Amino acid sequence: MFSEQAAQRAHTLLSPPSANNATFARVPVATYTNSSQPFRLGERSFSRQYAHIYATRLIQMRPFLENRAQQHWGSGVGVKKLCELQPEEKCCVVGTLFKAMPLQPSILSKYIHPDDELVLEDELQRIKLKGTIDVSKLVTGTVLAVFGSVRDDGKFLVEDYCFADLAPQKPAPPLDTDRFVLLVSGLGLGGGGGESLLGTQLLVDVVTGQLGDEGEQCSAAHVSRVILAGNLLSHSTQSASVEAVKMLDEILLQLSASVPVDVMPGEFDPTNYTLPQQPLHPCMFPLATAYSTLQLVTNPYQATIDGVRFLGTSGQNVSDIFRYSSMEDHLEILEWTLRVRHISPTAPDTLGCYPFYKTDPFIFPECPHVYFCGNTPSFGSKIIRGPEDQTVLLVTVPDFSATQTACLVNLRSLACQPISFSGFGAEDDDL
Amino acid sequence: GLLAFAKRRNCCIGCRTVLSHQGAVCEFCQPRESELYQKEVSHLNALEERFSRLWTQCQRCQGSLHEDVICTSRDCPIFYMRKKVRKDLEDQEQLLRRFGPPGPEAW
Amino acid sequence: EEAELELLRQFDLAWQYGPCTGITRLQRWCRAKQMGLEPPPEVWQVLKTHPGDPRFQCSLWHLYPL
Amino acid sequence: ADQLYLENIDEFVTDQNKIVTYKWLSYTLGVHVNQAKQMLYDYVERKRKENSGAQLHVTYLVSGSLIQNGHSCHKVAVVREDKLEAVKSKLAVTASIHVYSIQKAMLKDSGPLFNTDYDILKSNLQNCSKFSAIQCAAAVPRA
Numbered sequence: 001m002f003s004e005q006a007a008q009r010a011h012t013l014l015s016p017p018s019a020n021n022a023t024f025a026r027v028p029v030a031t032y033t034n035s036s037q038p039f040r041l042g043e044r045s046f047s048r049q050y051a052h053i054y055a056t057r058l059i060q061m062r063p064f065l066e067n068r069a070q071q072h073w074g075s076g077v078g079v080k081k082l083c084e085l086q087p088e089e090k091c092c093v094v095g096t097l098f099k100a101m102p103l104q105p106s107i108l109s110k111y112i113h114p115d116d117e118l119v120l121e122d123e124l125q126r127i128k129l130k131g132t133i134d135v136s137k138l139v140t141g142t143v144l145a146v147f148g149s150v151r152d153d154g155k156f157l158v159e160d161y162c163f164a165d166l167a168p169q170k171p172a173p174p175l176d177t178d179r180f181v182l183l184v185s186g187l188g189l190g191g192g193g194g195e196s197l198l199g200t201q202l203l204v205d206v207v208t209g210q211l212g213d214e215g216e217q218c219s220a221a222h223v224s225r226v227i228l229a230g231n232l233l234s235h236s237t238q239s240a241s242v243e244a245v246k247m248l249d250e251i252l253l254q255l256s257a258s259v260p261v262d263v264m265p266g267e268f269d270p271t272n273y274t275l276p277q278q279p280l281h282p283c284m285f286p287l288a289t290a291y292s293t294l295q296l297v298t299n300p301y302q303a304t305i306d307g308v309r310f311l312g313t314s315g316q317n318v319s320d321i322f323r324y325s326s327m328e329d330h331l332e333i334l335e336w337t338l339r340v341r342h343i344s345p346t347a348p349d350t351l352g353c354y355p356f357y358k359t360d361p362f363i364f365p366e367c368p369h370v371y372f373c374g375n376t377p378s379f380g381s382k383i384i385r386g387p388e389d390q391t392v393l394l395v396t397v398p399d400f401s402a403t404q405t406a407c408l409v410n411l412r413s414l415a416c417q418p419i420s421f422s423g424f425g426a427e428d429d430d431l
Numbered sequence: 432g433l434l435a436f437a438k439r440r441n442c443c444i445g446c447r448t449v450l451s452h453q454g455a456v457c458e459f460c461q462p463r464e465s466e467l468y469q470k471e472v473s474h475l476n477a478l479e480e481r482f483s484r485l486w487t488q489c490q491r492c493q494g495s496l497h498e499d500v501i502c503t504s505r506d507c508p509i510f511y512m513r514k515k516v517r518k519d520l521e522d523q524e525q526l527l528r529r530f531g532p533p534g535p536e537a538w
Numbered sequence: 539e540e541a542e543l544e545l546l547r548q549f550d551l552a553w554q555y556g557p558c559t560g561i562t563r564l565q566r567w568c569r570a571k572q573m574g575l576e577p578p579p580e581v582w583q584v585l586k587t588h589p590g591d592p593r594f595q596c597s598l599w600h601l602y603p604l
Numbered sequence: 605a606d607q608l609y610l611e612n613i614d615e616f617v618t619d620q621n622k623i624v625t626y627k628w629l630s631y632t633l634g635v636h637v638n639q640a641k642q643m644l645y646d647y648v649e650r651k652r653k654e655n656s657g658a659q660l661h662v663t664y665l666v667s668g669s670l671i672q673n674g675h676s677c678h679k680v681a682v683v684r685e686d687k688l689e690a691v692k693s694k695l696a697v698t699a700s701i702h703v704y705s706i707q708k709a710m711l712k713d714s715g716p717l718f719n720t721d722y723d724i725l726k727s728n729l730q731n732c733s734k735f736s737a738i739q740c741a742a743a744v745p746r747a
């Protein structure tokens with residue numbers, strides 16, 4: 001990929017001065033299209049209630065689950081509404097989960113408890129559930145189909161159940177010369193060390209073209225874009241924040257000089273709290289708004305970068321699922337989120353969102369080629385396949401303040417390589 | 432009586448001086464504006480977090496997640512504490528539209 | 539009138555068009571038409587032969603501090 | 605020619621008792637970055653061949669590929685003067701070697717090497733792509 005090509009030449013720099021030194025040029029970004037328009041909210045009227053969201057979620061997700069239960073259990077179909085069930089008869093039900101957990105805090109670290117019930121709910125009534133089903137892997141808000149019978153105590157006995165699955169995916173055109181994309185998250189400007197300072201300096205010095213030989217300068221010239229994904233100012237306590245926007249403005253100036261940059265709000269960043277987070281206001285960045293290479297987006301970000309389509313968050317859905325479930329692997333939680341056809345199924349019950357009423361926008365309408373996450377504690381990447389011809393690369397971006405690691409994504413081979421930065425510390429090997 | 436014939440202009444967010452035009456900042460306190468935007472968006476952020484914890488608690492006290500809430504229980508603190516945050520949010524959202532929009536929306 | 543005020547009160551409580559006590563009446567009529575559940579072409583034909591009256595173009599409980 | 609920057613470095617280092625990175629010695633003398641690294645290597649080679657016992661400390665940079673557990677990572681490190689060859693033998697592929705800094709009296713960690721670059725950036729803010737090896741085209745002040 002990158003470090004293979006970075007040694008492909010001769011080395012000139014352990015030498016006395018010369019007449020000329022080589023220069024290069026940044027590769028063109030001749031196609032780009034932002035398609036994150038359902039997350040940019042222009043009107044923003046509150047004063048509705050959260051019942052309009054669940055109803056449109058069920059009404060939109062129902063035909064997918066009917067069409068999958070047909071070909072997953074046989075076209076001798078027995079799909080039936082929750083009220084028209086007769087005692088001890090084999091049928092399929094399509095509904096919404098609700099997990100009834102105590103230890104979840106009310107108004108007046110994991111939170112799973114050894115006893116907690118699942119309830120299948122439709123628009124008119126509910127029913128309890130027991131049998132062969134996982135009690136702690138599933139969360140409230142998933143829509144699914146299920147197979148079984150109504151027993152004598154009013155409960156329901158489950159044999160097997162199925163999720164919605166992956167959406168269709170059109171193929172991408174192949175590329176001629178490999179272009180790279182760099183992904184960073186969580187610089188933590190405001191607190192978090194001094195080795196993080198030299199790490200941030202060495203990272204911007206490599207990507208801008210100040211560091212290393214003609215190998216590194218030829219290979220960093222091919223990096224086409226830069227994406228910064230959330231949690232730019234890590235905060236120690238709210239009640240500091242004014243002096244940090246000055247330094248963030250300086251860093252975005254030093255990056256806006258050479259590359260195009262995309263900046264996203266995070267868990268602590270001066271924006272709203274609900275989930276389609278709106279872009280940062282330009283009045284906090286005097287210096288960096290001189291150039292038209294800096295762009296400010298928000299939370300859920302879609303794009304079409306050179307044919308390859310991207311979609312990502314700053315890691316607020318994945319940690320929310322991590323709170324109220326039993327899965328630990330963040331790459332697994334990201335793939336599970338992909339499997340139920342919903343970016344954030346736990347919303348709104350433990351993760352706040354805007355009260356939409358026309359259409360729920362967190363249902364996947366297509367399949368992305370790349371799908372990344374936000375502030376995960378360690379690097380990971382994987383390739384997964386669909387039932388049809390659908391392949392997806394899954395990346396979890398590490399957190400720069402502890403690991404000092406970023407990710408390079410190739411746009412022609414579609415692979416991801418880590419990059420790590422480490423200056424020497426107070427290290428003396430004679431003690 | 433006279434109290435209705437107000438509005439059409441708002442006072443400076445920095446030093447409370449009534450003036451003609453709709454801009455939020457005063458001409459003497461125009462420089463310090465990034466700090467005055469920084470201040471009060473951490474208030475909108477904390478009102479947003481209080482709307483959502485309350486209006487979904489009624490859904491769990493009611494039983495259903497798919498139908499409307501009707502409970503005007505005068506002995507519940509939940510009622511009329513869920514009524515005032517709508518207006519706090521209504522007011523604090525409109526104070527930040529004094530500042531322009533952070534981008535376009537018709538693209 | 540007095541027969542048109544029961545048709546709208548019957549459209550407002552049918553559960554197969556949605557959970558609607560926060561929005562207008564014509565917005566819920568167009569929401570169901572987009573998804574095309576089965577809106578009937580009579581709850582439209584009284585919301586056109588009237589102006590902006592608050593006892594036609596409003597949900598049943600548009601008072602009522604809920 | 606040579607005596608110009610040789611005497612400039614000999615008064616910056618040993619008289620004013622300062623810490624000279626390559627970016628400071630390229631913002632002082634108005635030089636390209638790679639030529640500044642070559643200048644520093646010239647000075648250290650001359651004064652280390654002359655005497656062998658100077659009050660001179662160096663710090664280098666080593667970059668290149670590695671495999672920890674299967675995966676190919678790319679490790680970049682700013683290294684002292686004792687531990688260079690072991691770090692060079694741990695790596696798989698080598699991709700960049702030059703010089704980073706010189707000193708008079710030995711430091712304890714990588715503290716002031718950020719203070720120097722930060723302060724010389726602080727007053728020199730309208731140019732950072734001026735001596736950069738990559739010159740993009742669409743980034744010119746417009747808005």
Ligand code: SF4
Binds near residue numbers: 488507510
């Ligand atoms: S207002 Fe209070 S009592 Fe009524 S449903 Fe809400 S939480 Fe329960």
Ligand SMILES: [Zn+2]
Binds near residue numbers: 443
């Ligand atoms: Zn003022």
